[PDB]
Each structure stands twice: as structure tokens, then as C-alpha cells.
Amino acid sequence: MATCWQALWAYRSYLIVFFVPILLLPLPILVPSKEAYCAYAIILMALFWCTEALPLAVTALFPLILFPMMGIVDASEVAVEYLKDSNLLFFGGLLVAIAVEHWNLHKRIALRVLLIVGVRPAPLILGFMLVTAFLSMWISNTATSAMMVPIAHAVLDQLHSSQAKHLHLTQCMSLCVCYSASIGGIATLTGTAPNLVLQGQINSLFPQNGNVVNFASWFSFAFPTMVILLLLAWLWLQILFLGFNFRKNFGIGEKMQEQQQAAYCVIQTEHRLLGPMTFAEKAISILFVILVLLWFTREPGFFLGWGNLAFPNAKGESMVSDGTVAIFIGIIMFIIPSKFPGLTQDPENPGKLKAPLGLLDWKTVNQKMPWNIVLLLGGGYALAKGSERSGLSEWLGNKLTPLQSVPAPAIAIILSLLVATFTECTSNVATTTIFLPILASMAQAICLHPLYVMLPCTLATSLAFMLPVATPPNAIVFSFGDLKVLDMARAGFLLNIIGVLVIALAINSWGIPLFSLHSFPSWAQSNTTA
Template identity: 75%
Template sequence: MATSWQGLWAYRSYLIVLFLPIFLLPLPILIPRKEAYCAYAIILMALLWCTEALPLAVTALFPLILFPMMDVMDATEVCLEYLKDSNILFMGGLMVATAVEHWNLHKRIALRVLLTIGVRPAMLILGFMLVTAFLSMWISNTATSAMMLPIAHAVLEQLHKAPPDPEVGSDNPTFELQEPSPEKEPTKTDNAQVRPVAPAPSEPRAQKSQEQLRFTQCLSLCVCYSASIGGIATLTGTTPNLVLQGQVNSIFPENPNMVNFATWFGFAFPTMIILLLLAWLWLQILFLGFNFRKNFGFGDQEQGHQRAAFQVIQREHKLLGPMSFAEKSVTTLFVILVVLWFTREPGFFEGWGNLAFANDNGESMVSDGTVAIFIGVMMFIVPSSFPGLTQDPENPGKLKAPPALLTWKTVNDKMPWNIIFLLGGGFALAKGSEESGLSAWLGDKLLPLQNVPQPAIAFILCLMMATFTECTSNVATTTLFLPILASMAQAICIHPLYVMLPCTLAASLAFMLPVATPSNAIVFSFGDLKVSDMARAGFLLNVIGVLVIMLAINSWSYPIFDLYNFPSWAYSNATAHCFQHPPTTSTPQP
């Protein structure tokens, strides 16, 4: 009997994929309407995403099969949803991030910041959190964590052992990040599946003092938490942000480009800073206690250890040498990218997109995706050294030009193509919900929420999203819920962004479980942590995160996104009452 159960369990993925569509068939059979057909596809995909019986990207392809067969949407219309502007922005941003990683610019930034901050306990934690959050604003959260953790553990090695003899120089092998030199061979690791090589601990856990163990846990958790927090600050920082942009543009095509790089940064960056500082204080109190004098390094007993740890960082920074031509070129192009993003259509003045590339209505013809792809293409044009002629080893006697800053092999190895399909599947679901009438049906059912105060609605939804994202992919979570939230907002006559923005940020608050994000899993794999340690630290941080998001959406987000009234671009036949009889619970003035 036990063997039979084991066999069924081994084949559980096949059984789920086979029987789940059959189990859900009564829905479209008993209710032969487009709304039910679309609901069938959404429920099926949601359950497959939650169980991961199929790869997430494969499940995201289901609308291409189900919608045309069920007469929800034409196949050509569905296909167009899989490569929208948000996907292009994601691809362009990843190209630039790949160049930053490939030429080790992120490592130079990290070491430079740590040298500036110092290695006193509280300041060391703050330094790691700041640099991790900054890097995760631009490159993959997973790759950021994989790079920062070996640095953190190398510093801990020095802090937790006797100071070395200054006369005897010794390299710290645990500090080596085992990254190939960009001149030799590009990194072969996929962004979505980065697996760090954990440093070999110099002493068993049992031999560590409780104080050392707590500091190790604190420094490890600060890396993965700040990677998740930093990702919310920019539109390209984490995939749910791009899901929101794509869903808003798909569901509300008349919106005046409300969610772009500049407006998102103005809303999310202050939120990230506040949450990062509160997380720093919480982790410090939880693991280091209330002795702030000791935490900030006032005392002589630890000076030797701190000096040794500082020397490790200093030595590794010197090993990088002066900035190469490639690093300077990547830095220049990166700065140009950010400036172009901010000034394209900032909202409070005429951007270059409106002035130079406007259509007949004065709207910008270029998008953030256009800018990202332009800089990404430049990475393939600019050489990696100047002058850079060398002997071609394959053709003796002939000169060879240096490779460009990026090669297609490098980009192809690092590009998470699965996320692009996942984004496209989400956009297809949103469009199918609108075309089938499912969105309008959901809006009717949610009308009773009109009597609930809007801040209470946003708070409850944020808590729900933060809880749900602990168990499922944050991309899948936002993909499933954002169309429903848009329908709810239209039904109860509130600005759609008032509920969609905070819920998108809440989807990044995955702090409690190792399986919640790849960053958490990487930290957990390094040892010295139990699930209870992460859950204890992450529970209150989730609550703090939701409260900070509520502060943001009820204050400075109002002028940025014009949340004062229900917008005309969100109008539909189901929302005519919003303009005839404005709701009594109007959006509060900040």
C-alpha cells in the first residue's frame, strides 16, 4: 500500500495536469458563456501556478490554446499580448544589468560603499543593506544576493576570529566570489536560477558563541531582505512592477501613461528608503539587542577584529585595480539610461519624449522600453577596450578587435526568457477577462465593498497579497489579482491605481519563508539559519512593510498619480454610476 502511495506521489505532477482540467470542466459546461470560459482558463492556470505541476512559463502559454478554442479571443489578438512594451522594457533593462554584472561593476560598487561605511556592527549591517538595495534596483535580486552573501561571510570570518598578524599577509579564501573574469568567459548562470557557492565555514556552528551566531543570522537576513526591498524602487527592479504597468496599459488603454519610470520612482523610492531603515532597526533590535553603544562600535574590545575585516574589504577592492575602459563605458551608458528614463515624460515638465518625438496629440511616441533597447543595442556596438587590437590566436599574424561590451552569447545565457512568457501570459489573461465580460461580472459582485472605507480596503488587500506571495511566485500572484482589483476599483468608483499600486508593492514583501523568493533560498542555503529564525524576523517586517505602503499610497502618491478622483480613462458601461452619483466615501484628500 505504501509503495502505491509513493508511486502516486512521484507522478503527482502528471496526475494534476491530467485530472485538473477534467475536474474543472463542469464550469464551462453548465454555464456556456464567455465569462465562464475565461474563468475556467484563469482558475486552471492559477491552480497550476500554485502547484507548479508545470513550469510557470509553460502554464502562461495556456491562453494561446484556450482562448481561441473557447471563442474568448482571436488567436492573433492573444499572440499580440505576449510581447508588449513592458516585455521590451524588461529585456532592455536586463541587457544593461547583464553588462554591469559581466564586467564586475556591481562588485566594485559594493566594495567601495563598504569601505566608506566601515565595519562597526550597526554600520556594517546598514552598509550591506544600502548596497544590496541599490544594486537590486537595477539587476536581478537573486544575482545581487548571490554576490553579496560571500562578501558578508568573508567579513564575518574576520570579525569572528583573532586579528591576523600584520606582518603576515594572508588572503581570505572565503571571500573569492568564484566569478569568472569577464575577459575570459561570460557567466553561464541564468538570472532566475543563480546558485551561489557557499563558503566553507571556518568553524562549526556549535563552536560559535551565541553573539556571533546572532550577528551572522542578522547579516545574512539583511542581504536577502534588502534585495527584495530594493527591487520595489524602480520599474525594472522586480517583475511585479512591470506586470502592473502592462496590466494598467492593457485594461485601461486610454490612461495617459500614468505608470512610467519617473512616476514609479517618485512613488516607490521614498517607500523603499523608509522600509529599508525600519528593517535595519528591526533586525538590529531582534538580533543584536538594544545596546546601541556596542552596536555602533563604541569600545576598544572589538577594534582588532574590525580592523582585520576592514583590511579584507580593502584588499579585495585593490585587487580589482583601476577601472577598465569597459567599466567606464558601462557606467556612462548606465547613467545615460537613467537620465533618459527620468526625463522622457516626468509629468511636472515637458520631457524630451514630448518635445522631440510627439504625435499629433502631443503624446510621446517613444516609451521607457524604447530607451532601454537603445542603450542595450549600444552595449553591442561599443568595444570593451580602446585601443584594443590584439593578435588573433586562431589566425597568427592577423590582428583581432576586442569584443563589444555585450555579446549575444552573454545575453542569451543570462536572459530569463521564462519571465517574458510569464509576463505575456498575464497580459493575455487580463485582456481575456476584459473581452469576455468577466471583469464586468466581477465588478458587479464586488459592489457591496463601496460602503467600506477605501484605506481599509487597501490595507486588507495588501495583507492578503503579502500572505499569498509567501507561498507562490510574486509574478503569478500579481498576474492573477491585478485584473480583479481593476474590476473592483471600477465597480466601487475609486481610482484603480489606489488599490493596484499598494498590492503590487505588497507582492514583494516575501520575508517569512525560504521558498518565498530565490534570495531567501540562497541565504537559507548558507547555513546558520532555521525556518523559525526567518519567520520570526519576517513576520513583523511584513506588517511594517504593509504599514509603510499604506503611508505611501495615502500621502505622496496622490499628486504623483492624481488619485483625488475617479478618472475618466477608467470609465466603462459598468461604471456609469460613478459619474452620475459619486460615492459618499470619496477618496480622502491628503
């Protein structure tokens, strides 16, 4: 009878976990190679994340058993890949956010934000996108996400509670903060790390170049690209999760103004009934401002920060990172009392006073920390390390070489598509470092100017929108549990193509004059050209 078909549909995750590793076994069986053994693991983890047949942190533990059991890397070497400085930065940022939420400062910030920008979905999403992109121009993307994801969560909670469809707004705001942190970092030379890697490669492979890639020329090239890509991402996320209406999205017309003025006066009254700030709110607000100001001035690149003055290494770089500052502020939050004269009496011995708790105690942290996101970030780093140790990146980099029998405006588009597809599985810095010296020689072989193929390769590494392991902002937005990986993939599949087309617009207009991409200059000559 038909009662077996519901039993087969209820058990669908067990069937996925049993049948997906069997159906992909022809790839390691028919092609015995470490590149195929790593491609099997990448396809398996992507299929287990998009279907969510297992929890996210459980799928993130799969390199630890997969890579030693096919000879890619040792268990000792895959074990120290799961906790880097970018993961400690997330730990310290969320350690500050837990103290913000515990002492009701998140309600103050959310009510003041909703009092300033109002209650309209698309202008509020646009304001969050613009602020996240401007912050990501100057600090790290991970620091921007770890600062901005709980603020958007609190604003969204207060917006829900003032109106008593919201489950699409909670996806649109999370994905817009996630994508704005990645988009805004490409506009400056110090915004994302591969932007510096390109300058290191241009200085090493081509001396006598005369500092062709600096702060001013990179800004003049990559700021309109960032603005156009951010506005198109706003329009696409507004179309996909909200409607095609554009008057309901902007709150235009009556039967919409009435509910919006009612929600605005409800927000006004519940903000008025908060009172003065307590001692803990003032202390946490001062520490938050100090943390963001220390993140700004640590290593700016266009002037000399406190990380270069105090604590330099032999190369002059800072030995202290952003995660060090985050862990420092989070440790200080355990030491400052929550009330200063707060000497109470304990339920034990009746001759004792009692010191207050700190701004953080350990049991609040243990109840509130997303440890699955720590494990997800670590599993992403381990999969990215296994892709370099197996030889996938060297194999796919050497497939870009026979593209020489293609006209030059199409080489950049095909290369940008390939790099934007491959950067979902790997690291941005490693992909840039491996892929740039191949493209430099490929451009020297056909007498094409470098940075016609090196600038789209550097920009396409940042177009990482589909998988949780593509960028650390892609994993940080799963901290509250309302998102699915299928929503992120469905939103990012078109954003990759839109970003590739925006890079192709930027390299063929206003990138040709300010870089002289039609001349093949004399600093790119060698013994193989002529």
C-alpha cells in the first residue's frame, strides 16, 4: 500500500547519508589519484551541507577521518588546521556580543537604529549593506561580520516584536550582511588579503615595474566595481526573498503606512520605557568603541599603525592581529565587575559579603557560544589545506594555460568564472598565490599585458557566495540557526555570474586607461618574448 512511501520520505536523510558516498565511488575507483581523492571529499561535503542530512559541525569533522584514510595528509597535520587566528577572532567577537546581549544593550542599539532609519524593509537592508561595506573597506571581513551579524539579529528581533513573511526578511538581512562584508573588502588594497598578495606577486615576478599597483590606482580601479556590485546585490536579494512589488518593499501607499506608523509608535514607547543606562551598559559600550578603534588603527597600510610601532617582527609587520585584540577585550570583560559597590549576601554562610559577577561569567558563555560555527570554520580550513596538499590547485591552475587560443576579452571571463567557481572550495590567499605566476607566464607567451589576467584573478577570489566554507563571513551567518545552506547557494549562484560580468565591465572600460592595458610595457619583457 501507499504507507511505505511516507516511511521512505521520512527517512530521507538516512538514505542520503547511505547512498551519496556509494554513488560517487566511481571517482576514486576509476581515477586512482590524490586529486580525485580530494575531489570526492569536496563533493561529498558540499552534498551533505546542501541537503543538511547531518548537522553542519558534524559534516565539518569529515576531513579528520577522510584525509588520513586516503593518504592525503597525516592525522597530526589535519588536526592542526581547525583553529586558526580567524577562528579566534570569531570567538572573541562573539564573546563581546554575548556580553552586549546579556546586559540589554542590544535592545538599546536596536531601538535607536529603528528610530533613526525607520521601519521599511528595503531601505533598512540597504543601510545595513552600506555600513557593512564601508566598515569592511578598512578592517577585516571576519571582524566586520562578527561585529555586524548580532546587531542585525537584534534589530530584526525588535522589528518582529513591534509588529505584534518575516522568515524571508531574516534570510535577506543575514545574507546581505554576509555578502556586504565580502564585497566591500575589494575596494581598498588593504581590505582583503589577496589584494596584497597580487602586489607581492607584481613586485616579485616583474621588477622594474615602477609600483604600478599602489593604494591610489587600486582605489580608482576597484571602488566603482564595489559600488556597482553592491547595488546589484541589493537589488537581487530584494527580488529573490522579498517580492517583485517594489512598493510593498519600500512601504509606499496606504494600508502600509498605517501599520508602519503603528510599529513606529510602538518602537517609540518601548524605547522610552528603558530608562538610564546602567553601569554594565556604559562599561560594555566603552569597551566596544575601544575595540573597534583598536581594529581600525592596528595595521592600516596607508599609514603606520600601533602594530608596527609597538610589536614589529623582522620584516616590520605586526606580530599582533585582530583576534589578539578581540581575545584581549573578551578577557578584560571577565575582570570588570557588573556593579561596583554591589556587595550582596550569599545563600551560604551568614558572615560573608559577596562580590558581583563580571560582565562575563563562564556559564553564560557556555550557554551562548556557537561552537558549531567554530567547528565549521575549522573544517573549512582543513578542506582548503587538503586541496593544496593533494594537488588539486596545481592541477586546475595548469588548465588555464591552453586558453591562449581564445581572444583576450574572453580569456578574462572564462578565467573569472573558473576562479569564482573554485574559490568556493579553497582559500582565497592560496588560490591567488598558486594561480598568479601561471597567468603571468601565460600573458607573457601571447604578448598580453599582465593585470589584464591578474586583476580579474585577484577580484574573482573574493566572489565567494555559495558555500559556508568559501569565506569566514559565509560561516558566521549560521550563528543563530535561521538560515539554510540552500538559501545561501540559491542566492549566491547568480551573484557569482553578476560579479564576473561586473569585473568584465571594469577591465574593458576605465581599467584600460588607468593601467595602460593595451600596450605590453617594457617591464614585462624576458628572454622568451623576443
